[PDB]
Symmetry: D2
Subunit: 247 residues, 4 copies
């Protein structure tokens, strides 16, 4: 112990696997192939009745930017209210202005509907113009946590900025590295930032059980309709053994 | 009269679809994966912004339609919540390993959907025996099937959809879907005899963001583009439908 | 009979497979991922030494538009000279203006260098603003063939315009349907367009033979699959053709 | 050599840009979206009349693995011969066995034909079972350069392994890091590996000059529309990478 591991998840099997392999917290995502959108209340319900670890709930009404229209803001608020109702232990979101600044006013009204639950500000943070200022606005606003790959393609690549962010934060806010953390990665990202909480994916692909396949059909939008991505217990295990070995 | 259906992702799209003349919207999350079950908040707001029937997708992930116990229990919970929150219909599909429709599960799920009409979705295009499949959906009581004739699109699958509509004899509404555009609608309608049809009618638009950072990928081809149900596109698809009479 | 089947090909294995399946002509089109780029001269040579059927060579310096700069044009001319030299029976290219008109002057300039080989104007044609006018321009310039999917997502999809182009051509230019044709739609394509030459890619995926695999690495999908022109696919397309 | 920079390039404009930005060497590529395919011989000719820096040439008959059949290698042999004939200043291929070993016999054949030109073993090396042992056999075969990501998804990710490889190579072979190097990760990579030569891309993406556009058409793959965009190696990106290199030591 000493470190906390978060795993984004999309199914009851993945949630259970993640808890099984030593995750301390799960983020419930839909649309993870798009960075995560707000899950259905039905997965929340079954996950909550399947796992004891906290279940944080993603509030993103679509992929793309985090410049939300009034109608998207309305959808976000309803989803906050319902996520509470059905047992979320936390909430995750992010909102920017067109200039790459966090949107204070919108963050204010979304936070007000989230309280008492902890709220982490997500990778929208990586799309910000001035991150050091962004971090400042986040804490005056009272976000417990920020998920960041240091405004770069991944946590390892963004390490130097993660490091600086942790220093600026001084424990007032949990700066969480996220984006591309693997077995091969974790130690360097931990030892190089001073972070105590981290977010990882730890999925592996598994072929479908279908015996009859029809290669002609593409349902999605433009690799196979017969593979599944599932949070892998063994991967989650080795991430935890790495975390406990650096202490 | 024809009736046109449109999958939709957001309130904006739902609204656009309605004003462009759509007769029914399906609420989908995860369009890029063929449709996943949407949050309950889109439902609620959409249900307040629109007077047209709103069908809800019940699909706990992309990929196959061979669901585990924990997945079917997620589907069951979502069906109840969707009724609770105002759905006017449900959409879903389930197959066995052999590529047959899974009667037992369809029955289970059907039982929880009642009284709402259900449409068996594109799972159907992944069947080994469509004529038999259609028969068992028929005996199970699904009102609708969405299908591209087991091919990569409605135009490509047109001969089989035509045969299906012949086999159905109006007992079930065979709805062509899959890449239906303003350019192929007339052919798809004239060549199938279909009365209802499913399209997407989206156009991709640019983000309002002035500050951009090309280095991060949330994941995809871009983080600064949006696809929205286009009113113009829905409108002309509707115009094409009122020229085929 | 009276149908010629053309197949894009990447490798000698695909070339052989094509011919062995009944193809009448092959196009050598590196970079199939991107609609075809101009192949290495070394694949021409080995293919030319492995196959009896005519081998047409693709002249495309890159993916994307067909708005070629001078340096790109310079590269296209050099590659046209080299393809001739290494035994191409035909050349394939296409060039457009900013307003989606075919580029007359550049087409004449590349044509003059291609002679006497037949030339086919390719899918660039699908990106034109007025295809009926473009067609008239292509025959005025002497392209023997045009590859086209009716300016739409695929040949089935663009079929009604392909039909109108063939009626306009009056057999003065071969209008070759191409986008996405397979065994499930061949018949329809031919019967609904009246085309006599058609273009396809009858490829199938194979698993790599690598026993040891490193999933973390990428290259510039899967790092462990192969697409290969399929003999049995090509044969069936030939059978569908012979029986119409 | 003293931070030597190599850029792999699609076209002449990009080759010219790379030279102008301070690139020391260029690898000529076709099919960059697939990790590098053997380029037409016509690019080489024109590139060779537009640039003074050495121009190395990819010999790779397709994407995917480096498990080449007989006809594939007979194409590689012909392209090596053809590339020498047209001015290649170097060669770079690389092959493997099913087991993840470098294929010694095949490498000897291809090597025999490339001589006297320098050859680099490319990122087939990252797909190898045991990279230390692989480094030895490349050393035994006489490759002057290896392009490598330390067997991971990028040079940064594989930095620790590239460090150990440079440590064991002892200057006998040039260990050149490559995956995803940029102007925001060059310094870490040089500083944490001790490498003297490095490979990057330095591209930016431009909108096509096409004014009339047809969105309904896709040329290649599967609906992976683009479609008027173009990737060109960027003079100023290469220049900044070079300034960073010169700044280190």
């Amino acid at each position: 112990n000493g470190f906390l591991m978060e795993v984004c998840v999309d199914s009851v099997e993945s949630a259970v696997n993640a808890e099984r392999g030593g995750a301390d917290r799960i983020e419930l995502c839909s649309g993870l192939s798009e960075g995560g959108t707000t899950p259905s209340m039905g997965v929340l319900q079954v996950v909550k009745q399947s796992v004891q670890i906290p279940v944080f709930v993603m509030i993103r009404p679509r992929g793309g930017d985090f410049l939300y229209s009034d109608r998207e803001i309305e959808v976000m608020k309803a989803d906050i209210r319902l996520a509470k109702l059905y047992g979320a232990d936390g909430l995750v979101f992010g909102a920017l202005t067109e200039d790459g600044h966090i949107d204070k006013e919108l963050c204010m009204s979304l936070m007000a509907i989230c309280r008492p639950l902890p709220v982490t500000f997500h990778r929208a943070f990586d799309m910000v113009h001035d991150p050091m200022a962004a971090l400042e606005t986040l804490l005056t606003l009272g976000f417990e946590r920020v998920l960041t790959s240091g405004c770069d393609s991944s946590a390892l690549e963004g390490l130097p900025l993660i490091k600086r962010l942790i220093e600026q934060a001084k424990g007032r806010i949990v700066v969480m590295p996220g984006g591309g953390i693997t077995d091969r990665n974790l130690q360097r990202i931990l030892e190089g930032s001073g972070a105590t909480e981290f977010h990882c994916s730890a999925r592996s692909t598994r072929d479908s059980g279908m015996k009859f396949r029809n290669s002609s059909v593409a349902m999605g939008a433009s690799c196979s309709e017969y593979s599944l991505k599932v949070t892998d217990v063994t991967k989650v295990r080795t991430l935890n053994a790495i975390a406990k070995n650096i202490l």
